[PDB]
Amino acid sequence: KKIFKPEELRQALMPTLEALYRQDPESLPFRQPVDPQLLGIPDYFDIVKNPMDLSTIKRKLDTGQYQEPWQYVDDVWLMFNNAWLYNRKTSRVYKFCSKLAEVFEQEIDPVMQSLG
């Protein structure tokens, strides 16, 4: 894979991550890792093998852990897929996940087009 400059990835992709943070209350379940003890859901790590959340993605962006932009896009979708997998279709977190995924699709859209 071709490697991008971490500072360049941050400048192109961080605004799309901040667009998710701005969603209130839709982003609230996603701003910190799922704490199954705090939330009363002990089976969470039985079902979600690769947890992901906004804070981890932001950390990976801030410390240059992504070599190329589709790794960022992979983590965002991992975050959303975890939530669609774990939560019931009738629940508020599922709805929030679908709202947030919509905002993301709009934003990531011209950004990846400008990185090619």
Ligand X SMILES: CCOc1ccc(C(C)=O)cc1-c1cc(NC(=O)c2ccco2)cc(-c2c(N)noc2C)c1
- The residue within the footprint of ligand X, chosen from 8, 92, 95, 106 (CB under 6 A), is 92
From 6-14, 33-41, 69-77, 100-108, span contacting ligand X (CB under 6 A): 33-41
Shortest separation between residue 2's beta carbon and ligand X, angstroms: 32
Q: Which string of b and e fits 49-64 if b means at least 16 CB within 10 Å?
A: eeebbbebbbebbeee
Among the listed residues 81, 36, 32, 22, the one whose alpha carbon sits nearest the alpha carbon of residue 53: 32
Token readout for 57 is 């993605």
Among 32, 45, 46, 109, binds ligand X (CB under 6 A): 32
Q: Which residue has the tokens 């990846």?
A: 112
Interface contacts to ligand X, rule CB under 6 A: 25, 28-32, 34-35, 38-39, 41, 83, 86-87, 92-93
